[PDB]
Ligand binder design. Sequence first.
Ligand SMILES: CCOC(=O)c1ccc(NC(=O)c2c3c(nn2-c2ccccc2)CCN(S(=O)(=O)c2cccs2)C3)cc1
Lengths: 9, 221
Amino acid sequence: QLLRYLLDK
Amino acid sequence: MELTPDQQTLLHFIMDSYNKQRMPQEITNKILKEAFSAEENFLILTEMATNHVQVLVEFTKKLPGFQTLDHEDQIALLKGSAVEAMFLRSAEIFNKKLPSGHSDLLEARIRNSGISDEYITPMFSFYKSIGELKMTQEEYALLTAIVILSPDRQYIKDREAVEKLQEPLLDVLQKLCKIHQPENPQHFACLLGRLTELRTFNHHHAEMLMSFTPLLCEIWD
Ligand SMILES: CCOC(=O)c1ccc(NC(=O)c2c3c(nn2-c2ccccc2)CCN(S(=O)(=O)c2cccs2)C3)cc1
């Protein structure tokens, strides 16, 4: 969620 | 021997990511100006630990070949290294980046933040053993990269793909220990020996949680 956002941006 | 131009490009690229990463002034000023109490000391640590998660993801994103890994393995590598990478960074800050009073004030804050003595004493024994190695910024940047790209992590589907990314970093680190410490030929084995000490923090941290921030809750539980 917050990890995937920060990872994929 | 000396680092090849290929390894120099790999080191510069790691340092480009690691050296840009700093603790914000708003947090640094909070260590010296905020009220001293178990609740407020704990709050500063939450703000600090939260900031590290953003720092970890940003550093990991730039590690050559990390973005080419399976999405599920990318999350597992981050979750598996979150605690270890934080204490390794904490060791760097507690032994170096401190003016005159921050070092002693933060130690007092960590000791009086409501964390049990059985978790506190191993932290400072680790900080003191790491401080005796007299590591450089290059060694800290590489050890963090080696901690993150650990193929031995739980629930990793493609461990060999992680091994491929880690091996060039262990080789750069091995060459750095021979050059900057030729009088101590066992320095490399000592750096890796401190990693087994770092790994014991994982069970300590899990125990501490059973006894925050939306970002901390996701990376932990
Ligand atoms: C270069 C910039 O690096 C960073 O962004 C960065 C580095 C290190 C840290 N460190 C910490 O947050 C931290 C913690 C502890 N000590 N400690 C520490 C900080 C500075 C020096 C020495 C030690 C113990 C409690 N844990 S915790 O996760 O259990 C916790 C969380 C909440 C309540 S309790 C956290 C933060 C950011």
